[PDB]
Amino acid sequence: GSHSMRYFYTAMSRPGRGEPRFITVGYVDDTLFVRFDSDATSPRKEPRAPWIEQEGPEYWDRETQISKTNTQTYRENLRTALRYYNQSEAGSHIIQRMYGCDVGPDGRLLRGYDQYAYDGKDYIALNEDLSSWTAADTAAQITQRKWEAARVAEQDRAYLEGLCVESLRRYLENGKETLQRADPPKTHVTHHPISDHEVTLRCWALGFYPAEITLTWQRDGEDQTQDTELVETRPAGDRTFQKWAAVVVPSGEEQRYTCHVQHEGLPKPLTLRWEP
């Protein structure tokens, strides 16, 4: 149905240990498809999914040049940020960027993004209107004024409304076997007695893609949101994800509890119980 493309930049200084490292990774949904690393022996954009490999040589050389130019630009950006924040040249700092587009089932732009961070804090971001900026502080206001003057937002908008959506459409078609295949969770409930009169019921979802999922326990049809232990969704290593949710229940009262699983690879909306 709905899909995303994002590129993620990290530029990290390391005084005493060479020049700042610049990395780019590109994703479609929860699938990594391209990477660049300035520390590579031969730095270039590399394919990381089968369906991107059929892009021609011109693609790969254009893409690689963008990132090689960005390695130099972001080194300059890091130097500039030291000045803006009155920081010494002895510390390690990080600029991050994430940008891209979300598209709906018809392949039309839902929304565009272009967000930056400095040292893990918001710095400047393109607003949803694709025409104005939000700066987090007076240093980022200096960048905003520069980018307003150069009409950067207009160029962003053109990319996000054009090339971003057009290339994502193409990737989704070339990768349709995987990118447009939702893998439902394989789901079970396990039983772990804590003590004589309480047990843990753990509801498991394994092998699913994309990562988005809902796992909830109900007691007598009532959500147990305050009392559910929920782990972060984690990658299995095979493109798929795992998650679990656990409740501690009084022994004997196990069948009062149901696990509810929503995932775009389902149907329905699954309901699970402990099965002795």
Binding site: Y7, G26, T69, K146
Partner: peptide, 10 residues
Amino acid sequence: EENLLDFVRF
């Protein structure tokens, strides 16, 4: 495909 944003710097 990436955006080649011209002269964009902090």
